């Protein structure tokens, strides 16, 4: 459970085991009883995600487990989609854009005639990814303000666009330029998770404040940094993925023609600059706009980011490190 | 210049020729001098779009030509992308998801390190689609509120997702179910155009009101209806597109195994139900929430929709009708 050497990060408290255990039992019931998420054989993979620790660690300010469950269901649904549609065996399914758009309608609803609406409605139960999105979004919409819901839909639209760029490149084994990879990884990104911190914390960042260019930069930087964290921790895992799975070290090595080690080390330095820039941008906004909802939201994003690093560091079931130090 | 027989629509006044002519000259200068939109050989296609009439007709309440130009630049950029990336010769480019995401960064900016940011910045001038988005969004961002800008980015994310579902299906000649086609056509949709009516009208629909579920349904229905208008007017044109280009009549005919004529006629009935549903949903919201910005926005969406039908009806350069009556 050691951190990537040289990776700039903040330690976090051990997550409340009582909350962890309650989330674990509730998410299991949701997955099995409400959305039929998986067949028996894939239960170990489910528990291996440690989503309870994940979310408790990422949302220390959640007033209740009900609040935590808003994020937990969405996290599990997000994984289910990426696992079932995107990582569909082979490099990338040619029909990904069609599958994702139809799944997207479970988040941003189809509106149509009396004839075609019911047929769409029925598609929402047709597979696990869509049952998962549909149910999870349902809970979110009931608890969050209309603005918080709209905000999440936009961030999900971003995520799906990110998936589709990754999938399009994989169809030809295209290795993008480093900045091009990073642009993709700005969208194919944890962003929809930290941005619901206010909903999960029981308050609202007003839409007009969310929309500020400086806030938008703060959010992008945070997502970018914490997403590269995944690149770093999952690097060894991905060397075994079908084809040549892209992550920052792999793209750096291939484009800049460096050895894997030097490319990985630079990738750590890239993460560090992103993380520091996020923190500086956050401090600047905290000062420029010291409204309580803004300050809470900024603190919650940082907590999510720190929690996300902690979850990656400790998840030895999913991840391990390269021998580069 | 006759309307599709049986198509429910509202007549509109002749657009102010003075405004039309001023938009025409300004958009030509933008296209040629600012963004180098096209080489000489494709000027006829440019003028053939009649974008001046289009926008004046669609935004009767614009206080100035500067306001009209906000929408006009974006319309022209939207076309340029769809023409240059999506209709790239052949059915659909395998790398579409990558090209669109990078173009999307001209709308929703990349945030990164000191090293990679400049390389991204340089990509914004690399082709006409990106010069067009970048410049047009630049003008929009200067004139609109941060919320109006965020709203447009979400609607552009929707549009690009729509492109990618269409492109993914085209890669295998997949004909979706009718409702599946309509779900795609809900995103691959004029929506980003009528939704900027308030910006172009010099006022703001507040974000919290935009976010209301009833408003979201009103917007989706309006976009859905006015987008099927295009299916109907461009049907004959598309019979000549590479492969089998999908539109509502073609999908209805293929899935429900009907002759082209009966499928087209049903497609008109589908349009009509969508249009009526939009109007009823709009009346319901006008009554439920009689705030001035809401009422103006609802009237502007309807004006855009009526204007969009008028532009299709009169554009005999681009469109013609089937002999089905
Ligand atoms: C939670 C969410 C919004 C999306 C899940 C996909 C995503 C954005 C990641 F960053 C997971 O990284 P990766 O796809 O590389 O998954 P890994 O196998 O390394 O854990
Ligand atoms: C203006 C905008 C946001 C996007 C342009 C693409 C689009 C959504 C259309 F509806 C054009 O229809 P089509 O793609 O069938 O173009 P046609 O060739 O029939 O005129
Ligand atoms: Mg993935
Ligand atoms: Mg990874
Ligand atoms: Mg098109
Ligand atoms: Mg058409």
Swiss-Prot record, chains A, B:
Cofactor(s) annotated in UniProt: Mg(2+)
Similarity comment text for this entry: Belongs to the terpene synthase family. 2-methylisoborneol synthase subfamily.
Full-sequence range covered: 116 to 440 of 440
A single GO molecular function term of this UniProt record: metal ion binding
E.C. number(s) listed in UniProt: 4.2.3.118
Keyword Manganese recorded: no
Role according to the record: Catalyzes the cyclization of 2-methylgeranyl diphosphate (2-MeGPP) to 2-methylisoborneol (2-MIB), which likely involves the intermediacy of 2-methyllinalyl diphosphate. Is also able to catalyze the cyclization of geranyl diphosphate (GPP), albeit with much lower efficiency, leading to the formation of a complex mixture of cyclic monoterpenes, consisting of alpha-pinene (6%), beta-pinene (23%), limonene (32%), gamma-terpinene (29%), and delta-terpinene (10%).
Positions with a binding annotation for Mg(2+): 82-83, 87, 230, 234, 238
Substrates-to-products reaction catalysed: (E)-2-methylgeranyl diphosphate + H2O = 2-methylisoborneol + diphosphate
Species of provenance: Streptomyces coelicolor (strain ATCC BAA-471 / A3(2) / M145)
UniProt keyword annotation of Metal-binding present: yes
Miscellaneous information on this protein: 2-MIB is a volatile organic compound that has an unusually low odor threshold. Together with geosmin, methylisoborneol is responsible for the characteristic smell of moist soil as well as unpleasant taste and odor episodes associated with public water supplies and contamination of various foodstuffs, including fish, wine, and beer.
Residue intervals passing through the bilayer: none
Name of the protein described by the UniProt record: 2-methylisoborneol synthase
Alphabetical UniProt keywords: Lyase, Magnesium, Metal-binding
One GO biological process term: terpene metabolic process
């Amino acid at each position: 459970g050691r951190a990537v050497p040289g990776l700039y990060h903040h330690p976090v408290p051990e997550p409340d085991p009582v909350r962890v255990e309650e989330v674990s039992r509730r998410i299991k019931r949701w997955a099995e009883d409400e959305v039929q998420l998986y067949p028996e054989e894939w239960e170990g993979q489910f528990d291996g995600f440690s989503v309870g620790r994940y979310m408790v660690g990422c949302h220390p300010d959640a007033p209740t487990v009900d609040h935590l469950m808003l994020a937990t269901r969405l996290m599990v649904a997000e994984n289910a989609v990426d696992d079932c549609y995107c990582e569909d065996h082979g490099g990338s399914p040619v029909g990904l854009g069609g599958r994702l758009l139809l799944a997207h309608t479970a988040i941003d609803h189809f509106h149509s005639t009396a004839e075609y609406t019911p047929t769409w409605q029925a598609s929402l139960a047709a597979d696990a990814p869509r049952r998962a999105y549909d149910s999870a979004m349902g809970y979110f919409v009931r608890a969050a303000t209309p603005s918080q819901s709209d905000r999440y839909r936009h961030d999900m639209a971003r995520l799906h666009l990110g998936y589709l760029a990754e999938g399009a490149w994989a169809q030809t084994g295209h290795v993008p330029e480093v900045w091009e990879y990073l642009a993709m990884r700005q969208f194919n990104n944890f962003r929809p998770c930290p941005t619901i911190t206010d909903t999960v914390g029981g308050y609202e960042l007003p839409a007009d404040l969310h929309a500020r260019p400086d806030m938008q930069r703060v959010i992008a930087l945070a997502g970018n940094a914490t997403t590269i964290v995944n690149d770093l921790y999952s690097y060894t895992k991905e060397l075994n993925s079908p084809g040549r799975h892209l992550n920052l070290p792999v793209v750096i090595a291939e484009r800049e023609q460096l050895c894997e080690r030097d490319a990985y080390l630079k990738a750590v330095e890239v993460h560090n600059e992103l993380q520091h820039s996020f923190e500086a941008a956050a401090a600047d906004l905290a000062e420029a706009c010291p409204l309580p909802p803004v300050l809470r939201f900024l603190r919650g994003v940082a907590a999510w980011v720190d929690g996300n690093h902690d979850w990656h560091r400790t998840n030895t079931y999913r991840y391990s490190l390269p021998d580069f130090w």
